[PDB]
Write a protein that binds this ligand. Structure first.
Ligand code: FMN
Ligand code: PNS
Lengths: 830, 163, 182
């Protein structure tokens, strides 16, 4: 016997069956909620204004929970538990709140701030209704880890990822204050104790370190200069990591030790390495606040002592001005350099170190990627290095498309990181001795017996449990002195990586994603709710989601595009690739060559041999002349044999007689398997005409540059079912060539190509044997450039078949061809 | 006054200027997105998200091309449509700054009536309004009519159409 | 490991677009029958002569490439009833389409292997002069060594075999195409 009560904002509404025993308690709240709720607008696009029924019921749960006192069970408690159970049944169809919040972002006209209100309100209600997360969630990910389909590694980032790291901690306490409220309250009083205990510590912490006060009242928060300083930033970046690890442990209804037992391993970039050894000790909610006491104590005593070893001194304003106008940021002791390989950077830091004395020298302190370094040293010295660098650097605008590749100016980024101390450098070595003596004063040691999971060292990549010496000494040494070799530490095998660390999208996770793309590893950013449009790396929701969306996998190129061998009934062996599968012949094509493949005798000798070849359209001037050529090809080839046609795109007269000729030959069932457009990539509408009207099996396209590749990809998205043959050729190819390298463009675009299963990706230029092609078929060609393997689907041989018996090329031209010694790929731009 | 669809160069300039909390003049069009945002990669990738939602397909490394060479590439496959992003940015602008009794329609009819601007130019003026958000409750209706007047005179000064 | 006997075999290698156990079955077409699913069921799983017959979009007449007539014939419409016998043994498999003919259900088409490399699609007219059904055997070479287009009309005597059918349906005389047109 329940009386319906409608709560509404403008058009959208929600009817709840409030029991008549507590209707007049609910009906007064309905009015008081309708008061605080603003005036409805079209689209509901205003902030503090719900766009969906779900986040209106949410606002009501948040408002009621505010009035409910958790200790004394008053009147509103009974209607909260009913309004919460209505919100669960109607809107949470089994999923977690984070899965719901995600679904609203991609369908409705909600915002990130609005969905963080929804989540806060739901979670606040759930704790004020005496309904803790005691039940183990059926999250697809952790279900899969139990089964053994998924291996999980937890990574923790450090400094340098964001300017305002504290806004991430504010956003945690703003949303999950009913979960982590006890962690922050413990960490604050731990720190406030450590400041009073430690000698001469209050002189560094002038404005204290009570972070509870700073999170309650944002006005009492110190300035951004105090927060960024490493005595504050170190411990509080610890706290933010542990806070994300708590929230993830509670929302899944695990104990810390339960959530840790699911991790195959943990590791940490820089000072994150501390938090990674802390969670590897954790057992249950009782002994968790002992692991945290260790992590907060270590990071604190790093910050306090690394600050005293190398204090950051005010800089001359000319340098600061020069660094801003040149787009290098505010000088710091650590300088990120993107799109330069480590030997290039190590060359530049040797030139810079030649002039400087011992104490003022810069070293490479973090090798995050292949092409993503970080140089530590004094800010004067690093400025010095930055002056040297910006001479080599190419301006932002200039088009080097018409310049040979090796003559081009290197286009790279160099920016000062937002960090106050030079971590992983020879400058902080005096500190090392002090930290070790202060960790034994507070009895903070880590034992290999307590560490349940393998925690990976940053320097060498070895597990820290197998070490002989004290773990705490190695951690401090790895943070302050030894460099980080992030590609060497992350050489673990794992299908999923959780980035707890600060930053989120700009955090350690997405950087590890870039290094590992195409090795079949999926990064989940476990500290940020958002949506990825490309959906290559997940956000927080993917952890908690219970459907199929919770367990996603990223492509493993070596395994997905592995070359295979297959054998027809006759017992003829074929290299099986994406491309050979379609055409049913080896993945080797002789491309359209003017004039080598103009000859109908060569096109037929090649097609009869077993191998696909194009008839060159560039040796014909009329439909009639090409029709007679085509009919000479057909008369000579075997029944069922096909061939293709190369048309030049920059010759519009050829296309005008050529496209209609192919269309009406294909209508009459001429064996024209495919069309290759050379010299350019068509426009979307022209390619849509060629795909739809011509009645071809596939379309070959020869992109010259990156922009051309992107234009092929766009044609492939337009017709996702139609097979495109992207024929990639460098400048080193014979005939009309480009200025481009063979390798560099593929390394960049290979990932974006492989997101389109219709694109059959064919490498050409500078090939004449199995030996020099094999590495491309396999994918090991890209392991010399410090990338994952990148297998190709087929090859083309232009120049190599110019001295065949069946080529019309005159005997003396064949002796001039054979006489050419040629060069290797390093010397072709001469 | 003739109807002209909004230029990708204008729309892109407004999206970048609005996102960075800066005036439409403080952002030079001969500058890369990674240059203007500098440090904050968080700002960079959520700008590239906004350019992905508005125009759809993007050129490679769009944060390493100046906003002119980016806008001219966007302008090819773009045609006057406000799409998803700018639509929902303008919906926020008026519901938070324009007073009650001031919807997009009333502002659209007022720009049509007083100034004589069709839908192609109305969009243009609404975008120039978004870039120089007054960040203030415009309770007084006439105050909000003086706002749209100042922005129609800004739009006129940029595009170069006399009023 | 340098062993040719570990290499997976198939009948014919080719035709597979880059985007992508029952012995005695009985499929029934409807108005809403998903055409591609229909053909995938008729084809089966083993790569053989019937896989080619039902999923190749093209066949070869001499050197030309025409639409697959076996797919056109078997295209699913209300009433159709495809019975497969010996689904597992390819050398004995017989696909037997039946349609409604004078109210009752009769065998219209009988796709099967005749020799090793000949697919015979016997098309059957039931409405004949003397009530006895008339067969038109259309013959296709099945060449697995050409995986792209393994099927091809046997164009020798195709016109005489078509004529011989039409003769039984039109002319009550002995079949003989040797008389002078003049
Ligand atoms: C003699 C010759 C003629 C060519 N003619 C054409 C042509 O008409 N159209 C085209 O797109 N490519 C043409 N190419 C380029 C080839 O299609 C292919 O890109 C190139 O030969 C590969 O490099 P490689 O020949 O060093 O193996 C020609 C190449 C050569 C050597
Ligand atoms: P943006 O897209 O350029 O983001 C890159 C980055 C912020 C993730 C990256 O530059 C970074 O974080 N590098 C800093 C290295 C580090 O994490 N710590 C340095 C202090 S030990």
């Amino acid at each position: 016997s329940t009386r319906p009560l409608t709560l509404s904002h403008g058009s959208l509404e929600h009817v709840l069956l409030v029991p008549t025993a507590s209707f007049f308690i609910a009906s007064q709240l309905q009015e008081q909620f309708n008061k605080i709720l603003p005036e409805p607008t079209e689209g509901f696009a205003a902030d503090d204004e719900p766009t969906t029924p779900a986040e209106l019921v949410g606002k009501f749960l948040g408002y009621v929970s505010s009035l409910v006192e958790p200790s004394k069970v008053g009147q509103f408690d009974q209607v909260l538990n009913l309004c919460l159970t209505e919100f669960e049944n109607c809107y949470l169809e089994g999923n977690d709140i984070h899965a719901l919040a995600a679904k609203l972002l991609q369908e409705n006209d909600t915002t990130l701030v609005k969905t963080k209100e929804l989540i806060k309100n739901y979670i606040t209600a759930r704790i004020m209704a005496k309904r803790p997360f005691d039940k183990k969630s059926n999250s697809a990910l952790f279900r899969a880890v139990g089964e053994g389909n998924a291996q999980l590694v937890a990574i923790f980032g450090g400094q340098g990822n964001t300017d305002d790291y504290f806004e991430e901690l504010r956003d945690l306490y703003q949303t999950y204050h009913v979960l982590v409220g006890d962690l922050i309250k413990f960490s604050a009083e731990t720190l406030s104790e450590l400041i009073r205990t430690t000698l001469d510590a209050e002189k560094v912490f002038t404005q204290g370190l009570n972070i509870l006060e700073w999170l309650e009242n944002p006005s009492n928060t110190p300035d951004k200069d105090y927060l960024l300083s490493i005595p504050i930033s170190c411990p509080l970046i610890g706290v933010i990591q542990l806070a994300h690890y708590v929230v993830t442990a509670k929302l899944l209804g695990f104990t810390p030790g339960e959530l840790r037992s699911y991790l195959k391993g943990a590791t940490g970039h820089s000072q994150g390495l501390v938090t990674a050894v802390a969670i590897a000790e954790t057992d249950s909610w009782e002994s968790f606040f002992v692991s945290v006491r260790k992590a907060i104590t270590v990071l604190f005593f790093i910050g306090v002592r690394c600050y005293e070893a190398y204090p950051n001194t005010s800089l001359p304003p000319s340098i600061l001005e020069d660094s801003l106008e040149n787009n290098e940021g505010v000088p710091s002791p650590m300088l990120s350099i993107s799109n330069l390989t480590q030997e290039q950077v190590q060359d530049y830091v040797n030139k810079t170190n030649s002039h400087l004395p011992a104490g003022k020298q810069v070293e490479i302190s973090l090798v995050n990627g292949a092409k993503n370094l970080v140089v530590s040293g004094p800010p004067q010295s690093l400025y010095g290095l930055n002056l040297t660098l910006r001479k080599a650097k190419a301006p932002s605008g200039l088009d080097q498309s018409r310049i040979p590749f090796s003559e081009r100016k290197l286009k790279f980024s160099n920016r000062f990181l937002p960090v106050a101390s030079p971590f992983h450098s020879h400058l902080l070595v005096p500190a090392s001795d002090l930290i070790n003596k202060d960790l034994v004063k507070n009895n903070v040691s880590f034992n290999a017996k307590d560490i349940q999971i393998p925690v990976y060292d940053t320097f060498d990549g070895s597990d820290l449990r197998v070490l002989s010496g004290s773990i705490s000494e190695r951690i401090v040494d790895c943070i302050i002195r030894l460099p980080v070799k992030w590609e060497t530490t992350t050489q673990f095998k794992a299908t999923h990586i959780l980035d707890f660390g600060p930053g989120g999208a700009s955090g350690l996770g997405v950087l590890t994603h870039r290094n590992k793309d195409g090795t079949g590893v999926r990064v989940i950013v476990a500290g940020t709710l958002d949506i990825n449009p490309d959906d290559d790396y997940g956000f927080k929701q993917e952890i908690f989601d219970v459907t199929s969306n919770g367990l996603k996998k990223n492509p493993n190129w070596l395994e997905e595009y592995h070359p295979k061998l297959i054998k027809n009934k006759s017992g003829k062996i074929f290299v099986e690739t994406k491309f050979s599968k379609l055409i049913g012949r080896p993945p080797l094509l002789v491309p359209g060559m003017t004039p080598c493949t103009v000859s109908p005798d060569f096109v037929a000798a090649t097609t009869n041999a077993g191998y696909t070849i194009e008839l060159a359209g560039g040796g014909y001037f009329s439909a009639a002349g090409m029709t007679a050529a085509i009919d000479s090809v057909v008369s000579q080839i075997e029944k069922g044999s096909t061939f293709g046609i190369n048309l030049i795109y920059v010759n519009p007269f050829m296309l005008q007689w050529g496209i209609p000729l192919i269309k009406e030959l294909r209508s009459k069932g001429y064996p024209i398997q495919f069309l290759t457009i050379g010299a350019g990539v068509p426009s979307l509408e022209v390619a849509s005409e060629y795909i739809e009207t011509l009645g071809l099996k596939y379309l070959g396209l020869k992109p010259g540059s990156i922009d051309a590749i992107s234009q092929v990809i766009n044609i492939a998205k337009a017709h996702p079912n139609f097979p495109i043959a992207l024929q990639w050729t460098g400048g080193r190819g014979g005939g009309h060539h480009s200025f481009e390298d063979a390798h560099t463009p593929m390394l960049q675009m290979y990932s974006k190509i492989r997101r389109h299963p219709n694109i059959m990706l064919i490498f050409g230029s500078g090939f004449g044997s199995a030996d020099d092609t094999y590495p491309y078929l396999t994918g090991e060609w890209s392991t010399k450039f410090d990338y994952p393997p990148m297998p190709f689907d087929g090859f083309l041989f232009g120049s190599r078949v110019m001295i065949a018996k069946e080529v019309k090329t005159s005997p003396d031209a064949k002796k001039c061809i054979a006489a050419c010694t040629g060069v290797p790929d390093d010397k072709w731009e001469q | 006054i003739a109807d002209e669809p909004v230029k990708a160069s204008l729309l892109l300039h407004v999206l970048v200027a609005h996102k960075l909390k800066k005036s439409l003049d403080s952002i030079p069009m001969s500058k890369t997105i990674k240059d203007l945002v500098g440090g904050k990669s968080t700002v960079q990738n959520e700008i590239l998200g906004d350019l992905g939602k508005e125009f759809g397909t993007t050129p490679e490394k769009p944060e390493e091309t100046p906003l002119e060479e980016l806008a001219e590439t966007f302008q090819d496959t773009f045609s006057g449509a406000l799409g998803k992003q700018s639509s929902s940015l303008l919906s926020r602008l008026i519901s938070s700054k324009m007073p009650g009794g001031f919807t997009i329609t009333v502002a659209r009819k007022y720009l049509q009536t007083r100034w004589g601007l069709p839908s192609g130019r109305q969009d243009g003026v609404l975008l120039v309004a978004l870039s120089n958000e007054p960040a203030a409750r415009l309770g007084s209706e006439a105050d909000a009519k003086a706002f749209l007047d100042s922005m129609a005179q800004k739009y006129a000064s940029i595009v170069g159409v006399d009023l | 490991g340098d062993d040719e006997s570990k290499i997976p075999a198939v009948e014919y290698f080719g035709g597979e677009s880059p985007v992508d156990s029952e012995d005695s079955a009985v499929f029934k077409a409807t108005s809403s029958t998903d055409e591609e699913s229909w053909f995938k069921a008729l084809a089966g799983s083993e790569i053989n002569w019937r896989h080619a017959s039902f999923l190749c979009s093209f066949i070869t007449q001499d050197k030309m490439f025409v639409s697959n007539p076996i797919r056109k014939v078997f295209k699913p419409s209300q009433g159709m009833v495809v019975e497969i016998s010996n689904g597992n043994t390819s050398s004995k498999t017989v696909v037997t389409l039946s349609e409604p003919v004078q109210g009752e259900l009769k065998p219209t088409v009988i796709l099967k292997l005749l020799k090793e490399n000949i697919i015979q699609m016997e098309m059957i007219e039931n409405r004949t002069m003397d009530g006895k059904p008339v067969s038109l055997p259309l013959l296709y070479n099945f060449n697995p060594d050409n995986g792209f287009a393994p099927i091809s009309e046997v164009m020798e005597d195709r016109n005489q075999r078509i004529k011989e059918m039409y003769w039984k349906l039109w002319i009550d005389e002995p079949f003989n195409l040797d008389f002078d047109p003049r």
